[PDB]
């Protein structure tokens, strides 16, 4: 806890505003208050005159739609001196330093005599406020000119909290009274006197716009306008009583922008409404009670951490929108009522205002989700979560924050089509003051209802919505809007639910004698798309049908059809970004591949069933030693192979799946390792013999393995199943491990580091490989979108020639980080969201100082507890102590399976490690500079190939796509298994050997999959090299240079680049075509 407390204090002092810029502002707006008093009074006027008073003035009054007309504006207008006051966070002294800039809210209370008791009807009082604001702006401008301050002051109108009904004046300073350096700007809020209108008449259920329907938004707008100072004094006493109010406020302040939460309007579409005030007001309600027994949930002696924790706990578990609502007394213990108003509500009986009116139903659940998931991290003790909770902005990119995004282009966008304007209709102005608010609610309801359980959260955002307009104009002007609609287009942003996202059918109400109301809305909403259909269980229900596609999800089809039918037949729905990523995933050569969804693992399952058939044959067979167990460890068994398995597609490098066979423990094993394996091969030899005899339909052949260095006797059996799949078999022996432990002990002290490396890769293939597949296969079920993303990440590595040095496991452990550790984000449910998160993590990963450790567990045991946790960092510190620069090891990837942390990240050259991080940052920077689109995505997935010193072009004799199982084909294995060689791509093997010969000087790379990244025909592959700095320049020759060099002087040599090329060309033979140096 002490670490967290000090982290808070460090965080505060970083964000504390500088007191000098404070003293500068009070110098200004104190003088501004003198200007306010200078303004003269005014007499009673009608709308007809004031239009003539403002007809020629530069100022124009900001009437709110519907503007007063001469008939209904018989009310008169007058101005009188206001009661100048300062409110907001600045009044409470709870503000912080903001690079974008902060705001000072000063309130002007119009005198009570300017109102009649019934002026809260039909926008009566508001129109008085608008002219009052306008009359101020006229006199402020001339008095601003008189005092010569206008040179560095810019004045513009704006809407308070993006509320169209509350225009306000905006005072900002451009580059003695100049406060531009302060990054502060004053807001002029024209509020009403307290208790001008009976608050009972202004309840959310009541109405105040005659046409009856309730008007919660307008009722709050007027009533909130009359209640500003009252909540100031309410917050003031709480700050006095509890010492940690301001500290808790600023922690809540910071948490909000990281999640993109503000006090602005949300019914318009923007995520927000919850600011400091809604945070701080909820503090006081809970400090005064909050429980179902009116018991205090927060005690005034609580520290900053405890005050913040309870509310993050409060918002997380108590529901304030659908079932339950909280009431408190500003002027009386706060009580949690079980009844709910179906909208977020924090009622105040003293003031009769619901502060949570600005909260949309959709945003509240999103808010509740963030509170709950932070509470889990707040309770977390194993890992420090201070940076994630506070020092990480999740709102920078919508795609990273939100799984799917659809942008909808409404028709005729210098006004909306007559039909769409007609749909808004008179009935909804009273309910929803602006069309932007109405259309968002229309889009949410149809989109929410159409998708249903397929999604978790839905957000509708009005792209290009402005809130500030010049004083010369009455209402904000959008270039597309034409003073009609303040937006460019709407974007439908979704949090999809992986469990039921790809469900082929949307279940509806059951059949009955009399069509029920739920059935009524069900048939009407989907129309022809609706149908009554029966299932195997015998249930009769109304249902609609969708068709899966390998390019798009079912959601794109639903949102398109649902939105066109209800909102507008002319709208255009397009999400091409997700389409590109789906296409970049290879399309297998299986029946109905195009119709198959990206979440379907049928291809992997058919491989397992074929293995099961061979799994039975091997056991019933009689051997000198009984078979203990057969453990498949291949990539396809863990749903990670770059291309899905295809029958007889043996050009796929992943065609042969590793399988570990272990026989029963015996004491007759040879104690000599070369004798040990020749006994191992003698097993597989017998397995081949009776397998050939008893089951002739299976074909088999042996091959050598050289993955373990110096262990040149390993022989593996490759079994070609009749189904069209290949399996590769190797022995595991209990003696094998200890012999390697014997191997390290006897070695000379100089050779021991080399031998342990041999042991490291042995356990990576034999011992730890079993554990990696077991855990990953189980965890993959919970993370439905882990399967698609990891291939696309590996596909991305192959395009940039990184898979050759990166073991497949390391990519998997990297790709799973956003899921077991999704904070501060949510678990991805989309291919684009999951992939970009992997790229983001690499961009911000400091592998020199920050270790990567994961809990390979299903979502909330095997979780890392504190003792095992601390052990792993202690390993990282010890390794970094010996390797501070990280030259020997770069990525420290550890887990329960790998506590050492060096198992799957050893042997990678430093250039490749920096290249991996280099591409990720440029990828993130590319997304920053240019938003996600088709051109960027192609730019992400294409290789530069220029920075490489020399580039070698290869072309295979035949196209390898069709034998690789990729749809732009063999149907049986060759009669002679030697013919298999003719249809392989060896370039992955070629590069490996040349690395060994030229490790000291060159780093060659090649594309491991040629069928996927080999152009149209999948026959083109490239070898790219790099000359190290030392041998790039001239060197004095020595027997230990260990390089191919040419003499220049008697005692100097230089790299012989051309001789290297000829060796590559001869070794490539016909495959090599062109050389670029």
């Amino acid at each position: 806890s002490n670490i967290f407390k000090l982290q808070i204090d460090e965080l505060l002092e970083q964000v504390k505003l500088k007191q000098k810029h404070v003293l500068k502002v009070e110098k200004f707006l104190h003088k501004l208050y003198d200007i306010l008093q200078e303004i003269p009074d005014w007499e009673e006027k009608s709308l007809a005159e004031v239009d003539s008073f403002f007809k020629n003035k530069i100022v124009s009054v900001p009437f709110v739609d519907p503007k007063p007309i001469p008939q209904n504006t018989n009310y008169k207008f007058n101005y009188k001196k206001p009661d100048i006051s300062l409110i907001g966070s600045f009044a409470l002294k709870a503000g912080i330093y903001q690079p974008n800039g902060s705001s000072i809210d000063t309130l002007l209370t119009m005198p009570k005599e300017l109102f009649e008791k019934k002026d809260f009807l039909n926008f009566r009082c508001l129109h008085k406020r608008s002219v009052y604001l306008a009359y101020l702006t006229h006199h402020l401008l001339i008095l601003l000119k008189k005092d010569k301050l206008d040179s560095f002051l810019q004045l513009e109108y704006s809407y308070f909290d993006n509320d169209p009904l509350l225009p306000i004046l905006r005072i900002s300073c451009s580059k003695d009274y100049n406060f531009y350096k302060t990054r502060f700007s004053i807001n002029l809020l024209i509020g009403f006197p307290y208790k001008v209108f009976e608050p009972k008449k202004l309840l959310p259920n009541r109405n105040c716009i005659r046409i009856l329907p309730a008007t919660p938004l307008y009722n709050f707008s007027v009533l909130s306008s009359s209640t500003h100072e009252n909540y100031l004094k309410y917050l003031y006493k709480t700050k006095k009583q509890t010492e940690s109010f301001v500290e808790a406020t600023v922690l809540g302040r910071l948490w909000l922008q990281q999640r993109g939460f503000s006090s602005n309007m949300s019914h318009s579409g923007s995520l927000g409404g919850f600011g400091t005030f809604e945070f701080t007001i909820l503090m006081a309600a809970l400090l005064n009670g909050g429980g179902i027994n009116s018991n205090k949930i927060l005690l005034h002696g609580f520290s900053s951490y405890q005050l913040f924790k309870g509310v993050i706990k409060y918002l997380a578990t108590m529901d304030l929108c659908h079932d339950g609502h909280l009431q408190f007394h500003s002027n009386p213990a706060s009580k949690y009522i079980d009844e709910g108003f179906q909208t977020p509500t924090l009622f105040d009986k003293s003031t009769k205002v619901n502060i949570l009116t600005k909260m949309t139903v959709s945003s509240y659940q999103i808010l509740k989700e963030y509170a709950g998931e932070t509470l889990r991290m707040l309770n977390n003790v194993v890992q420090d979560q201070f940076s994630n909770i506070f020092l990480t902005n999740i709102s920078r990119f919508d795609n990273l924050k939100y799984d799917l995004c659809y942008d909808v282009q409404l028709p005729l966008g210098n006004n909306l089509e007559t039909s769409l304007a007609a749909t808004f209709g008179s009935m909804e102005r009273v309910k929803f003051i602006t069309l932007e608010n109405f259309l968002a609610h229309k889009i949410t309801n149809v989109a929410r209802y159409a998708l249903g359980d397929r999604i978790k959260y839905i957000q509708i955002e009005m792209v290009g919505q402005k809130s500030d307009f010049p004083i010369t104009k009455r209402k904000v002007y959008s270039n597309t809007g034409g003073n009609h609609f303040n937006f460019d287009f709407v974007r439908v942003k979704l949090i999809v639910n992986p469990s039921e996202c790809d469900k082929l059918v949307t279940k509806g109400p059951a059949h009955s004698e009399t069509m029920s109301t739920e059935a009524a809305v069900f048939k009407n909403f989907w129309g022809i798309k609706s149908s009554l259909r029966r299932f195997k269980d015998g249930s009769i229900t109304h249902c609609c049908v969708w068709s899966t596609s390998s390019s798009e999800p079912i959601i794109s089809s639903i949102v398109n059809f649902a939105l066109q039918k209800h909102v507008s037949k002319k709208a255009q729905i397009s999400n091409e970004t997700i389409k590109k990523f789906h296409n970049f995933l290879p399309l297998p050569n299986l029946p109905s591949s195009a119709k198959t969804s990206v979440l379907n693992l049928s291809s992997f399952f058919n491989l397992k069933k074929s293995f099961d058939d061979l799994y039975k044959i091997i056991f019933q067979m009689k051997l000198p030693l009984s078979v203990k167990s057969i453990l498949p460890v291949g990539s396809a068994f863990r749903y990670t192979s770059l291309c899905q398995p295809v029958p007889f597609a043996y050009s796929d490098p992943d065609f042969f799946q590793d399988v570990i066979l272990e026989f029963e423990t015996s004491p007759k094993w040879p104690d000599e390792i070369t004798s040990l394996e020749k006994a191992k091969t003698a097993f597989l030899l017998k397995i081949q013999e009776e397998l050939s005899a008893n089951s002739s339909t299976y074909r088999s052949f042996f091959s050598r393995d050289e993955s373990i260095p110096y262990n040149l006797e390993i022989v593996t059996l490759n079994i070609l199943t009749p189904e069209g799949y290949g399996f590769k078999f190797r022995v595991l022996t209990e003696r094998d491990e200890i012999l390697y432990l014997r191997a390290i002990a006897n070695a000379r002290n100089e050779l021991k580091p080399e031998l342990e490396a041999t042991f490291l890769k042995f356990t990576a293939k034999y011992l730890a490989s079993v554990r990696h597949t077991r855990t990953l296969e189980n965890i993959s079920h919970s993370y439905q979108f882990y399967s698609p993303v990891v291939r696309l990440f590996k596909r991305w590595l192959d395009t940039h020639l990184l898979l050759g040095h990166i073991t497949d496991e390391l990519a998997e452990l990297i790709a799973i980080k956003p899921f077991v550790d999704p904070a501060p984000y949510f678990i991805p449910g989309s291919l684009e969201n999951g992939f970009l998160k992997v790229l983001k993590f690499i961009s911000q990963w400091n592998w020199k100082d920050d270790p990567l450790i994961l809990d390979l567990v299903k979502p909330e045991s095997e979780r890392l507890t504190l003792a095992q946790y601390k052990g792993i960092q202690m390993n990282f510190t010890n390794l970094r102590n010996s390797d501070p620069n990280g030259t020997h090891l770069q990525f420290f990837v550890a887990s329960k399976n790998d506590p050492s942390g060096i198992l799957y990240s050893s042997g990678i050259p430093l250039p490749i490690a920096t290249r991996l991080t280099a591409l990720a940052k440029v990828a993130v920077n590319l997304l920053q500079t240019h938003g996600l689109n088709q051109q960027t995505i192609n730019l992400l997935f294409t290789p530069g190939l220029k920075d490489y010193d020399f580039v070698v072009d290869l072309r295979t004799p035949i196209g390898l796509k069709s034998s690789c199982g990729i749809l732009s084909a063999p149907s049986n294995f060759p009669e002679n298994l030697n013919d298999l060689s003719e249809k392989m791509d060896p370039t992955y093997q070629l590069v490996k050997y040349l690395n060994l010969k030229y490790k000291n000087s060159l780093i060659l790379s090649s594309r491991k999959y040629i069928g996927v990244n080999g152009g149209e025909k999948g026959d083109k592959n490239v070898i790219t090299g790099l000359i190290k700095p030392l041998f790039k320049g001239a060197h004095k020759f020595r027997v230990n240079l260990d390089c191919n060099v040419k003499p220049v002087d008697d005692e100097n040599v230089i790299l012989n680049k051309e001789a290297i090329f000829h060796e590559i060309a001869a070794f490539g033979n016909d495959m090599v075509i062109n050389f670029e140096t």
Binding site: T914, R915, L919, K921, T942, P943, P1029
Partner: peptide, 14 residues
Amino acid sequence: LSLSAGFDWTASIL
């Protein structure tokens, strides 16, 4: 165009 990054061999990029 292409996603091209200067090769860093001193780990200076991090």
